[PDB]
């Protein structure tokens, strides 16, 4: 019973990761934040100052 | 024009410095040059 429950839990984790798109929230947020910082730094050249 | 060599280029007043290669990307007839997501030129249509 415990082995079956563990296997079902692992499969459910796989299915939830595959279905839910916002699961990787922290990593996606850090990547997007770093990319946005770089993009704003690059766009800062067009500033007239 | 020189390709695959780092050369300062001037196409229709672009005055950009870089290396030139044949690009697979397509351009509309009126469009003359392309820009990146960071507002930096990345492709030029040759006027000649």
């Amino acid at each position: 019973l415990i082995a079956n429950q563990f296997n079902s839990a692992i499969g459910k984790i796989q299915d939830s990761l595959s279905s839910t798109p916002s699961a990787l929230g922290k990593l996606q947020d850090v990547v997007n934040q770093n990319a946005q910082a770089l993009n704003t730094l690059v766009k800062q050249l067009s500033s007239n100052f | 024009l020189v390709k695959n060599k780092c050369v300062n280029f001037n196409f229709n007043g672009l005055t950009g410095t870089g290396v030139l290669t044949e690009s697979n990307k397509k351009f509309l007839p009126f469009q003359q040059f392309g820009r990146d997501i960071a507002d930096t030129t990345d492709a030029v249509r040759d006027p000649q």
Binding site: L24, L27, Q28, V31, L38, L41, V42, L45 | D36, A38, T40, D42
Partner: peptide, 22 residues
């Protein structure tokens, strides 16, 4: 989970293959 104006992105010391091996 999903050009250069003086910037550069140095590759990580441990590649994804090596991290997967770990």
């Amino acid at each position: 989970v999903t050009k250069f104006n003086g910037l550069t992105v140095l590759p990580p010391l441990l590649t994804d293959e090596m991290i997967a091996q770990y």
